[PDB]
Amino acid sequence: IVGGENAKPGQFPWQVLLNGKIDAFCGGSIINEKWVVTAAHCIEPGVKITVVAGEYNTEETEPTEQRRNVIRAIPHHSYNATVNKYSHDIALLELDEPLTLNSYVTPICIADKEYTNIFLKFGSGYVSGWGRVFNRGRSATILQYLKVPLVDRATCLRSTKFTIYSNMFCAGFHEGGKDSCQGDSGGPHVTEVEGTSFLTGIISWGEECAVKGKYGIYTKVSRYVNWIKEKTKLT
Template identity: 30%
Template sequence: MKLFIILIFAAVGALPDSLASVMPIKDLPQSQSIDGRITNGYPAYEGKVPYVVGLSFTRSDGTGYWCGGSIIGHTWVLTAAHCTNHGSSVTIYYGASFRFQAQYTHWVGRGDFVQHPNYNSDNLNNDISLIRTPHVDFWNLVNRVELPSYNDRYNSYNGWWAVASGWGYTWNDGGMSDYLNCVDVQIMGNDECRNTFGSNYITDNTLCIRTTDGKSTCSGDSGGPLVLHDGNRLVGITSFGSGGGCTSGAPAGFTRVTGYLDWIRDVTGIVY
């Protein structure tokens, strides 16, 4: 179900309602499809982001939708809970530059989805899921991304640069781009992001990015990675954006991975 909650601001000069509303990235309104896009990004050369996977979900009624995810271990993919929440199965595309031309694929049923037990679909808190997969060998086109260490738990990352990646539309009203795209974005402080979305959405377990010049994640980029330029560590999972659209200039929100290191360790055994 689409989330469209208007946040009320008493301050003079508050953003228009359409910008202050929040939607899961896959449900943003510019397209009736929930296929993905990176807006105003650039094509990823082969092997640039070997950790990103395409996730083609199927619902119980046979309909489908697209999300992204990150390889974090030989048998684990990390994604958003709003991606797994309505899926009955998923086909995972590994090492794909063109969306459906993967090095190989794996099919996984819902029994291998491990969704965070406290996921809240109303405010997208704890928007994180794990998918257990068959064993995957690593090489230059298919490889894991490193998680942050426990030492990073209290780093705000304010002002740090990162890269997001995904497939699909490259502008609000364009057609699908089947080629993998990246966009370089700057992480902003949560206090500034709360001025747009409010504290109900922006918690200590959230990261936000600036969308300068319309550079952002959108639609089925949901669940995809936000990886630091410095150290190549996975710090965010694409979660939500402004109801005003991907190129509105409002921030975009990510699940903060450092907030879930204990949970990831308990489920997967992966820790740094």
Template identity: 25%
Template sequence: MYSIVVISVFLFNVFASAKDVLTPVPYHASVRTDKGHICSGAILAEKWIATVAHILIVQDTDAKLNVVVGTNQLNGPGDSYAVSKIFFYPKYNSSYILKYNMALLKLDKGIKFGSQVKAISPLNSDTKEGANLVVTGWKTPKDYFRTNNLQEKYVTSISNKKCRNYFGFVDGFHLCSEDKSDFVGDADYFRDAGGPLVENDKLVGILNQFFGRLPALYSRVFKYRSWIKKTMSKNK
């Protein structure tokens, strides 16, 4: 029989690396179909959401996408907006899902902003190695536990050179982070693609993929700024 100490240590290790968000994350969005949440995203403007491409590309052609904002809970109250159009980064190729993995969602009407719903702007400079970052998202069925509450995790950026020791395909459009927890590292990290990665209240990344104890991989928003600006400007 396991002792109380062993059980306590196990539970601490499981829950230490990601925790429930206790205050609103006004820029975080839930992207959904009629079957429920499929990925997360970041609110860039009244009608625009930044998210990952690889989740969207596999949806049924007749799937109706909508975005829910203003809630930390998947089954909680929030404001829903229909998606009118999807814009994939031009170089994205579904055969290489982790390359150029970025998409924009245009909503059919403007989001109503308030204290719990706000846009987030990209950082004007590139993220450096060793930056302190926070990423948010919901746990998925692939995680140890399915949670209804939005999760947050504090991580540190690492250089692409170091990241290439794990993933040889990493280039300038990628951003990697690691967890410096004394215990389980990223073992309980959520796998919610599209989760916004933030530095000093500015958007720096969109979660592409999580690989357990290995570094997490993001789209580096700084490299997509021109495309984002141009796409939003041409499709008002």
């Protein structure tokens, strides 16, 4: 995460790191011990992916790590029909063997339609991940995090080429200099209300990273939330 600060161990326990063809390729958020969740545009024909749970410094080997291999990988009933493939940038990876839940492996909270938006509209969220440290160049070995103020629809439209529909929302810095990035893709965007952090975004795309004038943009989980609620019901 460019413009972030180092995260600290044990403090981000929903931060799956999605491992496949390239190693460090997408982040993910433990929707719970048996399923983790991620942007749909990390689902490649051919790759076979591996959630790295309790990870801290990639250049080294932590006792909290719990890899699984994705036993199957749903994306939403409306990902892309060959059309605009970053809209409902969302998806669930069923892990094969259930993760042992602990203080380094802990699911983030998925608050219903009406409330996830409310948390989302408190206007600053903790974005995290191992992605690029600088704009094209250097990836974060030891988990990076960053706070992001919500940046309004009207303005963020004003920084685009592309179509920013409603299943996404924009956020980052007006004065360019810090954002998520490629390699952060799929990582979390959560807001904490008084301890309990809730997920309100999948970190998605962005006309480049942390580029003064252009922002990075995120998925609007408000929408898919119920869907998430449905399909992970261990009960």
